[PDB]
């Protein structure tokens with residue numbers, strides 16, 4: 644188990660050292676997106692929450708293909724403003740309900756340290 648707490652102030656520095664195997668040891672769901680919303684990384688805890696198979700969703704677009712319930716001003720709209728501005732750090736509750744039992748989660752979106760990548764972190768509430 645990797646010990647990093649959800650919501651930690653310097654989480655992007657800590658997660659910069661992990662490969663996909665290490666990300667699978669986190670206590671919470673983690674998705675890495677490019678600035679178009681394509682999925683680059685998707686960990687085991689996220690798949691436990693959503694039912695998706697991690698290897699199968701890498702390369703898909705999160706907003707168009709995987710998670711249409713997030714294509715809303717309340718989720719996608721926040722992401723796209725962050726990508727446009729080059730800064731993003733926001734936490735909110737949301738319900739995931741596409742092809743699954745409706746599940747309430749806490750979401751933390753934060754710009755990654757390097758380049759044009761963005762984290763989505765998720766835990767149950």
Ligand SMILES: *C(=O)/C=C/c1ccc(O)cc1
Nearest residue numbers: 693710711712713739741
């Ligand atoms: C709504 O369509 C949410 C879907 C969803 C959220 C997060 C995931 O990792 C996968 C699907």
